[PDB]
Amino acid sequence: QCEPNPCLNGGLCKDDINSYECWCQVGFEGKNCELDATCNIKNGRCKQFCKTGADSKVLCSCTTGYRLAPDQKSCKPAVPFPCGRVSVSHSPTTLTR
Amino acid sequence: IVGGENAKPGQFPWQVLLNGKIDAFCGGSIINEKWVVTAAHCIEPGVKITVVAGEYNTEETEPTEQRRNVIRAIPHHSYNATVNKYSHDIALLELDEPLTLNSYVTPICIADKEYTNIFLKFGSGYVSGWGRVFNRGRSATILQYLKVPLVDRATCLRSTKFTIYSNMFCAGFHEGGKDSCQGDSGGPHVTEVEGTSFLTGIISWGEECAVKGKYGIYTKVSRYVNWIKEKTKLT
Ligand SMILES: N=C(N)c1cccc(-n2nc(C(F)(F)F)cc2C(=O)Nc2ccc(-n3cnc4ccccc43)cc2F)c1
Numbered sequence: 535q536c537e538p539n540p541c542l543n544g545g546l547c548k549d550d551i552n553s554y555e556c557w558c559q560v561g562f563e564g565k566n567c568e569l570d571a572t573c574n575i576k577n578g579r580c581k582q583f584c585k586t587g588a589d590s591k592v593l594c595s596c597t598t599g600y601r602l603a604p605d606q607k608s609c610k611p612a613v614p615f616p617c618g619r620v621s622v623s624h625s626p627t628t629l630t631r
Numbered sequence: 632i633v634g635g636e637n638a639k640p641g642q643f644p645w646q647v648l649l650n651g652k653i654d655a656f657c658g659g660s661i662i663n664e665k666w667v668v669t670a671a672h673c674i675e676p677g678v679k680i681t682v683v684a685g686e687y688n689t690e691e692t693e694p695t696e697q698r699r700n701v702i703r704a705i706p707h708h709s710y711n712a713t714v715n716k717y718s719h720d721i722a723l724l725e726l727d728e729p730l731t732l733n734s735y736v737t738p739i740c741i742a743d744k745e746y747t748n749i750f751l752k753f754g755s756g757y758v759s760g761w762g763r764v765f766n767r768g769r770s771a772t773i774l775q776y777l778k779v780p781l782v783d784r785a786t787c788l789r790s791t792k793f794t795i796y797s798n799m800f801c802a803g804f805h806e807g808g809k810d811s812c813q814g815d816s817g818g819p820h821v822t823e824v825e826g827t828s829f830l831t832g833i834i835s836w837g838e839e840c841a842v843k844g845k846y847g848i849y850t851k852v853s854r855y856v857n858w859i860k861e862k863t864k865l866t
Pocket residue numbers: 715716717718763766767768793794810811812813814815816834835836837838839840841846847848
């Protein structure tokens with residue numbers, strides 16, 4: 535599938551037997567990471583806040599207290615006790631069963 | 632909270648309880664370890680208020696409790712000018728000694744103008760608090776919570792006497808039977824997007840509580856958000 539990479543713009547081709555997809559990256563949208571991502575197409579793929587910018591290219595980011603990971607979409611707590619999460623039912627590695 | 636279910640301990644860690652002349656009088660939402668926030672109509676000339684942080688069963692004494700006393704208490708640059716005193720029903724209480732942040736003392740999240748509305752317009756929010764358990768009568772000792780579907784401007788106007796402007800929004804049940812209440816006043820109205828809960832309301836007033844046909848109404852934090860952002864900047 536992946537000879538040469540059908541996913542472009544930097545994305546990543548997990549080819550399969552039958553098929554293959556494009557793990558896409560930031561900035562980028564559509565199938566083969568063809569067209570740009572937009573703050574209205576799935577939040578921008580940002581996990582908290584989607585913004586646009588000078589260009590029409592996006593800009594993910596976070597509330598006071600979280601820090602936008604290096605993938606640039608998901609938000610990581612950046613201080614011990616972060617805003618608006620429950621913390622009894624998750625420490626250390628627990629889910630509300 | 633009438634028509635709610637009991638909340639569970641440690642699950643609502645932004646739920647300040649505002650203590651003053653009467654004991655259990657308004658709720659509040661830890662905008663952060665040094666300032667909590669609340670409806671402006673809980674600011675009385677004369678009372679000196681005390682945020683009860685990690686509280687669960689009022690009839691009993693929890694190790695997570697952290698009271699402070701309000702060292703000062705801003706309300707918005709447009710509360711009421713003797714006119715209609717439940718519009719920008721909003722305000723910050725600076726605590727005097729900073730709260731020790733923990734799993735029972737945890738601030739709620741204050742998302743910017745553009746996003747707080749988006750969370751608000753997903754149409755169901757977790758309202759919580761120690762207020763009345765029934766319509767006039769019995770107050771919730773052990774923290775009460777409730778989910779509230781967003782109820783539209785056009786209809787909620789149709790249930791009022793009073794002027795519902797835009798800094799408020801309406802929510803509750805069409806089939807009357809469950810709402811916040813007096814004593815819940817100031818408590819939170821938050822929406823969670825995938826873990827992270829964000830504040831989108833101050834529980835404000837309501838032509839009575841949980842009355843079939845009439846709803847309870849809430850402040851539109853979208854508006855004051857930036858303001859909140861400004862004035863609590865520990866940085
Ligand atoms: N339903 C709720 N979520 C809720 C929340 C807070 C308080 C009350 N309770 N509880 C009770 C209980 F005691 F009976 F239980 C009474 C109330 C309550 O809020 N009375 C009340 C307050 C203000 C106005 N009012 C309406 N528009 C206004 C515009 C300007 C000024 C006042 C304005 C009309 C009212 F009915 C209900």
